[PDB]
Amino acid sequence: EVQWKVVEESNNYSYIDPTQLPYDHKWEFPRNRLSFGKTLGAGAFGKVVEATAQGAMTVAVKMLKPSAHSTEREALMSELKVLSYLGNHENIVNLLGACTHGGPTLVITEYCCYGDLLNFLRRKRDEFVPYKDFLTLEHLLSFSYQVAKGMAFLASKNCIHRDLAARNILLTHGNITKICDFGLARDIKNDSNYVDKGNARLPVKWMAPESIFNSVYTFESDVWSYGIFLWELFSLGSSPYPGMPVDSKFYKMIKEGFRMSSPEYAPAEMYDIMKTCWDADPDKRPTFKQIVQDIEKQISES
Ligand SMILES: CCN(CC)CCNC(=O)c1c(C)[nH]c(/C=C2\C(=O)Nc3ccc(F)cc32)c1C
Ligand SMILES: [Cl-]
């Protein structure tokens, strides 16, 4: 299941069972104060809908479809539990409330009015200018910085995203980016950026080699995916390894050290970050804390 995980020291780390996390009923919000509007996204067993919450503000509500298995209802509760455990950060999509009694489970989160960053980059591409409502290099550096800060936050809570990519970054007012976990509000069997692997469907072009070939997911594999995200960002939304099918040839190239070339709009210091994120040795990749400091220096030099 493609979703984030909280880990605990064991093994090195093992996933926690999120059903065992506590749920504080302080999050409880009266269901009668929600007015539901348009659907923003929909998986096979769930969906996220724009809503108005009186006591008015626009929010996003995650909920199950009526055909949901009993393990899906628990899964949505576990989503709520993980969000409550993580706490609040500017660069994640934050929990605002929940409805857990008197009806089906509703998870109320922040609404990001511009949608996912990938599609935003793609429709802004032909107006982009490196320097001077155009998208500029200043914005891209800001987005890189914010996603690094959000990931540093998740890592500090022992959380591994496992699917970091521009499609999972949302954009809201003030050019603020927020990391998201679609969970039951997305069906990946649709999306060609996921690839069949055994029983699983996986975002192979974003994954570290040790995740693909050894099923190892760590703080360090998230850094690999962040490097792929940077490439998406400074390519203005191009698909990674463009024109290369995922087959045995692709896997061999990754294993033997093949990497993407620099996007034409990436500053050399940002391509330097990408390259270190894609070190075959996870111990040689930077931490998100290091990445934050490096990008802070570039913005200062800007
Ligand atoms: C296909 C691109 N289209 C624009 C050109 C669609 C635009 N994209 C949109 O409208 C959109 C908006 C405005 N919000 C979301 C998603 C979420 C949001 O806001 N909070 C969440 C919390 C959890 C979650 F799992 C998803 C969301 C979308 C897809
Ligand atoms: Cl910021």
Side-chain angles (χ1 to χ4, degrees), residues 2-8 12-37 39-44 46-53 55-126 128-131 134-188 190-300:
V2 179
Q3 63 176 341
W4 51 16
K5 294 286 188 175
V6 177
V7 298
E8 59 182 343
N12 212 334
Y13 296 95
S14 54
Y15 302 160
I16 78 174
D17 174 0
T19 66
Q20 298 308 292
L21 288 168
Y23 170 61
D24 192 340
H25 284 261
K26 77 175 181 189
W27 290 112
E28 205 68 26
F29 184 76
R31 183 189 310 263
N32 59 50
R33 269 146 69 163
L34 288 176
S35 301
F36 302 96
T39 301
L40 307 169
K47 67 178 174 179
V48 50
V49 177
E50 177 181 355
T52 295
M57 85 176 275
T58 303
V59 295
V61 183
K62 311 187 79 175
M63 64 187 61
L64 304 157
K65 291 181 178 185
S67 63
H69 197 277
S70 66
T71 53
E72 294 302 320
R73 308 196 284 277
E74 277 311 311
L76 190 60
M77 204 64 161
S78 292
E79 263 195 61
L80 178 55
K81 289 170 174 178
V82 168
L83 281 170
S84 179
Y85 156 82
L86 291 168
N88 192 280
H89 190 273
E90 184 177 38
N91 297 120
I92 69 170
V93 168
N94 290 293
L95 179 63
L96 303 178
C99 312
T100 63
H101 53 74
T105 296
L106 309 174
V107 179
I108 305 165
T109 69
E110 287 176 322
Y111 170 81
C112 305
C113 57
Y114 293 106
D116 67 287
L117 192 56
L118 182 57
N119 274 347
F120 175 84
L121 297 163
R122 291 179 169 179
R123 62 180 183 271
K124 289 294 202 169
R125 174 186 313 182
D126 56 11
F128 173 85
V129 288
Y131 312 90
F134 299 141
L135 190 69
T136 73
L137 204 62
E138 180 188 2
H139 297 114
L140 304 187
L141 285 177
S142 179
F143 299 158
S144 305
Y145 177 44
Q146 296 182 60
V147 173
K149 284 191 289 179
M151 290 300 297
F153 175 77
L154 292 175
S156 78
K157 305 292 294 188
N158 290 319
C159 179
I160 300 168
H161 189 291
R162 303 195 308 163
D163 191 16
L164 179 60
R167 61 180 173 274
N168 289 324
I169 306 299
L170 305 188
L171 183 68
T172 185
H173 299 109
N175 279 311
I176 299 298
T177 55
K178 294 177 166 290
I179 301 161
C180 184
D181 180 64
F182 274 77
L184 290 328
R186 179 193 274 160
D187 192 336
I188 61 174
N190 297 327
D191 185 341
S192 69
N193 297 287
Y194 297 80
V195 180
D196 288 349
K197 256 275 205 185
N199 292 288
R201 198 161 166 84
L202 297 173
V204 165
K205 288 191 169 181
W206 283 260
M207 287 169 64
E210 69 270 16
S211 305
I212 303 177
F213 306 121
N214 316 86
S215 295
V216 173
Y217 298 84
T218 63
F219 307 117
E220 295 89 357
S221 60
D222 270 358
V223 169
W224 178 289
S225 304
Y226 175 82
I228 304 293
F229 162 71
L230 286 180
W231 190 96
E232 292 182 276
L233 180 58
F234 289 93
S235 72
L236 296 176
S238 299
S239 295
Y241 308 92
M244 300 192 45
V246 174
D247 50 17
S248 68
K249 174 166 177 291
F250 169 82
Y251 290 129
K252 190 172 196 184
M253 301 179 78
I254 294 292
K255 254 180 262 203
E256 294 190 340
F258 159 60
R259 306 296 183 251
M260 283 184 282
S261 54
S262 62
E264 57 179 315
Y265 292 130
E269 318 87 79
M270 293 303 297
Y271 186 53
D272 290 335
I273 293 181
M274 289 173 217
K275 286 189 298 178
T276 66
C277 292
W278 301 330
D279 204 297
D281 184 347
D283 298 321
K284 297 191 177 177
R285 302 176 192 153
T287 63
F288 283 114
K289 277 180 282 183
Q290 291 177 283
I291 290 167
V292 169
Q293 295 179 339
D294 190 307
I295 300 173
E296 275 169 346
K297 177 152 296 177
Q298 296 178 53
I299 297 170
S300 295

